[PDB]
Amino acid sequence: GSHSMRYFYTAMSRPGRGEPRFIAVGYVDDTQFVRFDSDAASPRTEPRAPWIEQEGPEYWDRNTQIFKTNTQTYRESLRNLRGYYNQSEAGSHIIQRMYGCDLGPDGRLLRGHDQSAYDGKDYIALNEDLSSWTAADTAAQITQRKWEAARVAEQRRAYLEGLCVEWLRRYLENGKETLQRADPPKTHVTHHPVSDHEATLRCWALGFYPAEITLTWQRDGEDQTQDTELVETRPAGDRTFQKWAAVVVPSGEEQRYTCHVQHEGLPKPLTLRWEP
């Protein structure tokens, strides 16, 4: 496919410091477009992308009611899970949930998602059939039984195949100038002598969008996966991302190394080498 929409919910208990905080953020690909934080002075769904601002009052009020209701529901869920694990009321815990839809390059639903975790560990997930569940343990099995009895899978599926795809396609059109624009990475290789007979070759990729990118070093046409230091792709703050890969090589053998860059914004993969 080529596009996706995802909502990320985080509910965190904090005994002695008020009721569990609920935060929700929505993304289209690697672009965040909305947020809600129950801890805000006056909790309300807020825009985070220019193209969502055009949505009317009803849109925002509808969103706010949903997240305000979720704030209450997830607090109930945290109380339930605490019990499923026989946990004390003194500890802080977290429920996380990711859900959304993926569309193919044509605009058709590729697949749907609905995964939950408790304290950072997979808890329950809706299977790809969007009809059955996979529970991680006997506690999640209780949630599963509860959701099967209530026909929750059917409600999630209805959303994923309907509203999710409908609104995603709408967002893609409204923000086509950015959401449907891939920015290729600006690339270059730096050289850093480490000693008399070894130097570091660092391949840079800057200002690209989306975040998906492949950066690799090859020696004599052979990639150095095991010898390459690859940092995590990081956000620049202007919607674009940055990434670099480095390899320590023998002085004088620099030309036997080549950096290969693959990015959606590149018509053809790139091959770079250090240019003294």
């Binding site: 909502y7 849109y59 509808r62 939950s116 949630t143 209530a150």
Partner: peptide, 10 residues
């Protein structure tokens, strides 16, 4: 747009 509420508790 997000999933309709109320959702079922865990």
């Amino acid at each position: 747009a997000p999933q309709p509420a109320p959702e079922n508790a865990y």
